[PDB]
Amino acid sequence: EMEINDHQLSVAELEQKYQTSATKGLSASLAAELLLRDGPNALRPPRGTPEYVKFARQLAGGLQCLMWVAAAICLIAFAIQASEGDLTTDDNLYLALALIAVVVVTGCFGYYQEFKSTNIIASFKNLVPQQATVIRDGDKFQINADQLVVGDLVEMKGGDRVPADIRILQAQGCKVDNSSLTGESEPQTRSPECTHESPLETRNIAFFSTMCLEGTAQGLVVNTGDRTIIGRIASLASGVENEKTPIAIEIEHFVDIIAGLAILFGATFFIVAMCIGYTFLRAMVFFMAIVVAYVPEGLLATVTVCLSLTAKRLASKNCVVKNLEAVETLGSTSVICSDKTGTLTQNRMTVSHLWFDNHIHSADTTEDQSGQTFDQSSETWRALCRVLTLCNRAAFKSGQDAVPVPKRIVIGDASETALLKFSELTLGNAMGYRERFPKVCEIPFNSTNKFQLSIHTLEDPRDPRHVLVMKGAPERVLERCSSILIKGQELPLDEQWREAFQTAYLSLGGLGERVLGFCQLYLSEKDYPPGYAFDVEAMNFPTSGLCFAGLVSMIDPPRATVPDAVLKCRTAGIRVIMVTGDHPITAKAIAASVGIISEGSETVEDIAARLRVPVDQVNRKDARACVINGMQLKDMDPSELVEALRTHPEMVFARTSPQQKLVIVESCQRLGAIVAVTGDGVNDSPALKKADIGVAMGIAGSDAAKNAADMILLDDNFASIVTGVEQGRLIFDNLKKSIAYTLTKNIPELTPYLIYITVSVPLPLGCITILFIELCTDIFPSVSLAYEKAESDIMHLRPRNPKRDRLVNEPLAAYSYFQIGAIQSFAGFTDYFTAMAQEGWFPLLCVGLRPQWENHHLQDLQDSYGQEWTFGQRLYQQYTCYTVFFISIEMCQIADVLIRKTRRLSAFQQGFFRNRILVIAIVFQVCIGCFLCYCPGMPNIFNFMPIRFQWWLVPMPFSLLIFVYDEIRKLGVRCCPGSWWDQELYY
Amino acid sequence: LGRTLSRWVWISLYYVAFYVVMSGIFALCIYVLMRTIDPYTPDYQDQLKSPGVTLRPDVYGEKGLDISYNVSDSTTWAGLAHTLHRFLAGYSPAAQEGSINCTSEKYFFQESFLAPNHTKFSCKFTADMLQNCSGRPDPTFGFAEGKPCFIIKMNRIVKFLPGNSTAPRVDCAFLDQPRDGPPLQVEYFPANGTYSLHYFPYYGKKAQPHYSNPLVAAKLLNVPRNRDVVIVCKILAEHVSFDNPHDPYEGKVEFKLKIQK
Ligand SMILES: CCCCCCCC/C=C\CCCCCCCC(=O)OC[C@H](COP(=O)(O)OCC[N+](C)(C)C)OC(=O)CCCCCCC/C=C/CCCCCCCC
Ligand SMILES: Cc1cn2cc(C(=O)N(C)CCO)cc(N[C@@H]3CCOc4cccc(C)c43)c2n1
Ligand SMILES: *[C@@H]1O[C@H](CO)[C@@H](O)[C@H](O)[C@H]1NC(C)=O
Ligand SMILES: *[C@@H]1O[C@H](CO)[C@@H](O)[C@H](O)[C@H]1NC(C)=O
Ligand SMILES: *[C@@H]1O[C@H](CO)[C@@H](O)[C@H](O)[C@H]1NC(C)=O
Ligand SMILES: [Mg+2]
Ligand SMILES: [Rb+]
Ligand SMILES: [Rb+]
Ligand SMILES: [Rb+]
Known part of the structure; x- marks a missing residue:
């Protein structure tokens, strides 16, 4: 920049370079020309943030890029159909429109929940200008810090905030607060002599953000704004790019699981459809029909509101998150790297x-x-x-x-x-x-x-x-x-x-x-x-x-909450590491004071202090704690550092620069660690950005630290964090309760159509209706599963092994689709053929019937009783087969939501009325299902009619079949949690 | 490369057994579902609040029944007649053997199931009752003229009953074209364009294996030439709807007609 020499310079050389005087300062005319030349003595924010292209990124992602691909395939399919002239091609344009409508309205929801998240942060931030007492033309007076230019002459005293990067020229007992840049909690002595060649250890420079504690001094400005030491840490902290969050990893994991099924189901039932002898256009348009049913049009919505209810839960406890993903991250987090000075301490x-x-x-x-x-x-x-x-x-x-x-x-x-x-x-x-x-x-x-x-x-x-x-x-x-x-x-x-x-x-x-x-x-x-x-x-x-x-x-x-908070995280399977720029003695003290280093554990320098050997001949494994100073850390090839990190389980890092802070997190993330950092000052901002979730003190935090951080604790109540892990594991558990619910039903949304392809029965279930399930009937149930509690004592578990324990996986996946969806499919086909035979169509006749059923040019087709129906009357029965496959799902899906409440414990044990939000949701499920049929004109508006109160009860003996298969599943998995049955039938 | 091999089968057999478990539950349900329902009468028959009527010969273009032919060109109506013939190929007295010459001239409730193999009885409508549009004398059913005959039929519903007052007739007219020339005019076979009331009611394709629908014709005399018109044939009974909007074939038939010279 301009500084690595400045402190080593003579007053003759300094006032030459910046054309000033060490007694009188700048001439006003020139201090104005420099202010134009160099801009204002402040920090350019991350200048590019257009409002419209914020909304742009609210539209990509795991599920959204899936819906887009599906939305596209809805339009590729629609053109294909109208090109050879097909009717009610609406249904391709309805799913495309709904797919795109869902991803849009999700993008809005988060956009406000950032604006409101970032306005509440803008609310807590102070916006009265910091001040400098300056000297120009030999006149001492006050100005704002930002109008300081490179070369100016200023003064300080106990209380004034250091307004620039300043070189000391005369110092009368001047001490200062460096905890924002260094971790040094001790005040630091300032003096006009050249202590070092690295200007971070020399005493003759004051740094742009720091606080003068006692004494007084006078000196010259050497670098303004971004070119300061302060400014070049956010430049790295902006240069830092952060990792993708654990929850987004678990989303794009199962996106790829969902796709894999749509593909083979399309391909197989295209290769199948070619052997029924279809048009290639149509064996493959079904291929596209197949893959699009496998997209749950509404899962993206249920996740974002599950997160919101936990995001709101945290916000009530003075805990703000910017984007909803980080709401989870703490729960799955396994390592905490923690700043000391200003973060663990007061x-x-x-x-x-x-x-x-x-x-x-x-x-x-x-x-x-x-x-x-x-x-x-x-x-x-x-x-x-x-x-x-x-x-x-x-x-x-x-x-x-x-x-x-x-x-x-x-x-x-x-x-x-x-x-x-x-x-x-x-x-x-x-x-x-x-x-x-x-x-x-x-x-x-x-x-x-x-x-x-x-x-x-x-x-x-x-x-x-x-x-x-x-x-x-x-x-x-x-x-x-x-x-x-x-x-x-x-x-x-x-x-x-x-x-x-x-x-x-x-x-x-x-x-x-x-x-x-x-x-x-x-x-x-x-x-x-x-x-x-x-x-x-x-x-x-x-x-x-x-x-x-x-x-x-x-x-x-330490802060009152901190020692309690630290030891509750350790008992929740989370190792803690102090990463502080303070000297190794204060480090170990606070480390033991809060529970980083436990009562009764030693560094190798305490064993060789007790046994009184040279440290040379001590065993490493026997020392439970270790302290590494910042500059002996350089000597360490990272594979040395990995030996030390898993050998000394209670680790403490001293005099660590912002660069080393980042490194330590990077070295952990390289070992499959979901790691979060917590900090106050700018020395934390780089590692605050690299972390899977960076947390910033909303009060004691520097701007770059809060900017780089994903989460903020406005009350500085450090114990807000432990309430976060409980949440992050709640929704995690509660999502695979909520997600498993919304996925099962895609199979009895597809199988009536799959059978319709290959068996050609009159269409059981319509894309006009399958959206009302996907996007209206089954939403209140799915999001209520956020309100499930622990089943275990959630806070007494390890964090999730990222590799073995996943949001969904082959055991949870296959169980939900091909076992529960099969029963819901058989529950529909049975209610289907009843409505057929009982309105007239014998199931055997329903075989291969579809060609004449949908035929517009027949108006007198004979049912099994030989009765002749017009098309507009067969229509209203194909609508009834809609309405009867639909209620088959609802009576089956009301059983599906209760049985996700509890993943190991029996719903007898935990309870039925347990989740009072989950109960209120289901009353909403039957009530709209009642409106959808028996309201006037519902036959024509959507494809639902007032159904007879017999067909309501036909699936209910399949509904209660489901409750007692998963009950004897999670009775047999809790009573006999052995080898065979605990892997297959558990999710 | 997946899960355990010798225990891959230990779940692959399970999925097999799981599906034969569900398929058999299904198999029971349909066996019950079939032994639930009555083999002569439909349990609910809900969408049948009125019968569709169905014209012949049926030729649609787009947007519904479009019948256009040029009398001079034999090819324009050669298949139109051939369908009317091969349709009435079951209405021959030869083919209509297992039936009876009904006389009642009013309703025909068979409460008693007396016939070959416990079947029941059915009336007769052979082609000759259309008398001019029966293929004899004119195997073109008036097409060669410019006075074509259109066979109008009603959909057959078990135990549906249309009324007492008169016999259920038909009536075919424009969609009003009053100022442009005279009102339409048609003669119907047999007289007054009535299906005789002794043909009702239906007892199902199982009870009456040899059954046929009663007919009337409509010879189109007034029709002007080289000109597009539309003709509704509304049925006039008391248990019938002919104006239902979301199903306009309920109790009537519309059709575009252009007879070209
Ligand atoms: C992925 C795995 C899919 C595998 C699906 C396999 C499902 C097969 C299960 C059962 C099939 C039925 C077995 C037939 C034998 C049972 C007994 C029987 O013969 O019963 C009689 C009916 C016909 O009665 P009738 O006129 O003789 O009685 C006289 C009428 N009276 C009584 C009023 C006088 O027999 C009939 O209808 C014969 C025709 C049977 C009905 C055809 C239904 C086609 C629909 C299939 C969808 C199946 C669900 C797929 C769900 C998969 C989810 C992944
Ligand atoms: C799995 C599945 C079931 N389905 C049912 C209907 C439906 O019942 N209705 C009301 C109209 C048809 O009868 C429509 C679908 N539409 C999908 C939309 C995606 O792409 C395609 C591409 C080609 C063909 C189709 C049919 C489709 C559909 N898919
Ligand atoms: C009717 O057909 C004859 C012979 O095919 C032809 O000469 C005549 O032009 C046709 N009339 C009209 C109006 O098309
Ligand atoms: C019409 O009814 C008579 C009864 O007089 C019956 O014998 C006969 O089968 C029918 N007519 C002919 C020509 O068969
Ligand atoms: C019906 O046929 C007879 C002779 O075949 C004929 O005299 C009579 O006029 C025809 N009906 C009409 C309406 O022309
Ligand atoms: Mg700090
Ligand atoms: Rb779908
Ligand atoms: Rb004390
Ligand atoms: Rb981050």
Whole structure:
């Protein structure tokens, strides 16, 4: 870009290259010409997103490319028929129109459910401009970050967001928040010297998104907008392309299963149809008729609404998904790669442990205050609490009485803010407590003095004397403390107490944490009266000999839900891996703190620490956990990495760049892993895009991370995720309940026609009617099967093996078509011939009859009783054979939906009335079937007539045949789940 | 390359047995379904709320009955007559032997099944009752003239009963063409264009194996030449519908007619 040299440059060389000055900045005339030259200092969004071509992609896919092929074959068939002059060629134009109408209205449904998904994301995003304090023509003032141009001179301070990529020139104790780019939760020191040649490790550059915590600095802009470090991570994260979702894989799997049957059924019944001696035009037009019945015109609809009800279920729990496929993905997901800083943690310095009264107390670290706080009963605390509260200069922004204290904005340092929040919660109205002990002398934290300190007058007026409070680097608090508060009294700081403060300081340093000492001293109102004048440079007060209060320590803590959430996913068969750009010590801590690394497991560097060997001679397998730092990961040929990954089951990756994050997911996806990543900052966006489902904190998340992610958690409730797996496995189980239902009936939609081809009986079932099944009668049942519950304890299973456990397969496929569809076919043919014989046509006569039946030029054909019917009366019986094959299906299909409720358990055991949505659906199924027959004019409008209430009941002894074949199937598969019968008769 | 070989058969035989199980259930159902229904009378016969009537000779072009012929050209009506002959080839008194010369001149309820092999009895309609359109004297049934005869027939329904008042006649007319010349005129055989009432009602192709439909003709005298007309032949009874829209052959026959000179 332009930067890999910039930090190594001299001020003479820099202000030459960008034609500026390190003191005065740009001339306004030139900073305007550069803004035109380089555009605005922001990030071009993924510029190409036309509204119409969003709808375009809502129309391709597994099922849709099938319907199109079928829709085309409906038009190829229609022309073929009218070319040799065929009548009611409507029925080819009705299926083509319905096939295309279904794929269209599905494309609309999702289009809004993205618009509304992406407007609710646009709702949660902040749109007030970030700001820079700039210098131009030697004038300091405020502007917006976006008008910064390459070469400008700016300033920063505690609170201001870093407005560009900036080179440091002078730094006064400047610390910064890098957790968006690096995983570094620790603040980072900024200084104008060249620490490195890679500008991500050097200290003399500030990055475009980062947050300045405490201190102040000044420097020059070196790259603006996309050309920043920030901007070039989305450029890769845009360059990343994401994989096809697991559910879409399982769709195009069975699309190819469906096609395979249509083809052979067309070909065989074309080769069959040629041996009945047809026209080649017609042995093959049936071929096309055959393949098109095998398309369920309405399965695409039932899936999209099944997903919507789970998509909506999640949305109610503050969990937004962009496209409905990812709704499933969590359930089938088997690996979670998780960002630490900002994702597993709160990314907030919180007070964790304290030392006083010779005891290491641990506080409540959580955001909602659900945890377990410490003993505040003793005197040493109230003094220690007074010290930390009074020796604190940070301040809350006004009007924050509502928001929980952890989520409030404080004008102050990193350490000072954490204590202020801690002081505010533990004591209550911290700001007002220290106001009533009026401050009269103060010393800033210092390079030469190395501590903070203040002296105060006291609360009640009957005490006229003063008190001094001091905190700082604990060893610099101890050299000047000769007295310690202990158990009420104030004791001498002897060699018991000297060696006991150094063990604790380095004990809490052992947890990586940042810790300060706190101390106090009461001054005499004789030497130091009301009206005394304290001077600093003349040390007219004690800078030594103080009474020690205690230590207080801070750390980046996990989010309250996270540790529970982590260990519920592990118990659901999902390995977790931390992928964090923080240093390996904080990594292992949070890893054990939440349950990435379990209580009682070790890295190889703990075995060689316990056994005290060199690490050289330790066994790898015996270490349950391992930590790999980002730069030793380079040395690893991936096949080394695969040895390590399945050998150390609890893995932790430290100091990993956005590139390595992507790699680790890629290395897992290469091993048949459905893996999801979770992140906040831009370091996650690449791996957030590569993942099978990327998840982004809707609050703590950077824009590129949320853009690249497929799912967003707006409440930042990490435990929203586990509710996702339960869903993703629910619909998965519940889809192969819903899908198996809508597929069975295609066979008794085809067999009446297949028999019609080869036996030439009067047409049993019409494409005017087979659509009313496909697209009206059987929809409410199929989508109710979303509301099936677990049968097992769904959350206590492994994720689905992608290869063995599929959405449909040869066992589930053959059972639904060729066994259940056969019974529904026999159920129709029986109800067919009854209507025939009972209205006049003997089944034996129905053989080969069709030629004269549909013949328009006969008007007096003799039935078996010798009665002569006109064509327009044979019509109304071929309509009755429609209506009678139709009700045969409905009485059979009402049995089909109940028996998919339960895939292993007996519907006795689970229940009949179980799914109250599934019950309400079926009343809808018979009610439209009643309207379709006995409404006035229904004979002519569609091909249905008021049928006699005898033919209703003829299929009912086939309906209840079905219930007791699958019952003794899932009674025999639960009672005898052995080898033979558990594979064949199970789906 | 698929599943287990020696157990592929162990399910391939199952599918076999599964299908013979279902086919036999079916086989029982049709055996019952046949031994359910009556072998002389239809159980419901629902779409037969009125009988179709059916003209001869039947020639359709597109869109329905289109009868066009040029009298001078023998070939234009040679097959039209030949069908009328080979149709009445069963209406010969020779072929119509197993029947009786009905006299009743009113309804004929046979409640008693007395005949060869427990059959029943049937009346007679031999060609001669059409008397002019019977192929004798004119084997062209008036086609050679320009006054062709069209045999009109009614569909036969078991135990259907059309009424008492008169005999059920026919009546053939234009679809009104009033201003253009006189109203149509036709003579019918036998008189008044009536099917005698003693031919009803039907007791099924099983009870009456030797049965034939009663006939009338319609010799077309008034007809103008080289001109397209349409002729409806509505039947005039009380148990009959002739205006049902979704089946216009219910109780009538329409046909385009062009007699060319
Ligand atoms: C993929 C596998 C497909 C395999 C399908 C095979 C189905 C074959 C099953 C049964 C066939 C019937 C067996 C016939 C023997 C049974 C007894 C019998 O003889 O009964 C009598 C009837 C005729 O009665 P009648 O006039 O003599 O009685 C006198 C009338 N009285 C009683 C009123 C006086 O015999 C008859 O009709 C003879 C004609 C039988 C009816 C023809 C029906 C054709 C329709 C076939 C569709 C089958 C369903 C396919 C579903 C496959 C789904 C994948
Ligand atoms: C499996 C199947 C059953 N079917 C029934 C009907 C039907 O009952 N009706 C109302 C009209 C016919 O009687 C129409 C179909 N139409 C399909 C549409 C796809 O392509 C073709 C191509 C060639 C021929 C056809 C017939 C068809 C059809 N297919
Ligand atoms: C009728 O047929 C004769 C002989 O085939 C022919 O000469 C005459 O032109 C025809 N009349 C009409 C109107 O076509
Ligand atoms: C007409 O009926 C007579 C009864 O008088 C019957 O004997 C005869 O068979 C019929 N006529 C002829 C010519 O057979
Ligand atoms: C019927 O035939 C007779 C003689 O065959 C004839 O006199 C009579 O006129 C014919 N009928 C008509 C309507 O011409
Ligand atoms: Mg982050
Ligand atoms: Rb279909
Ligand atoms: Rb505690
Ligand atoms: Rb993705």
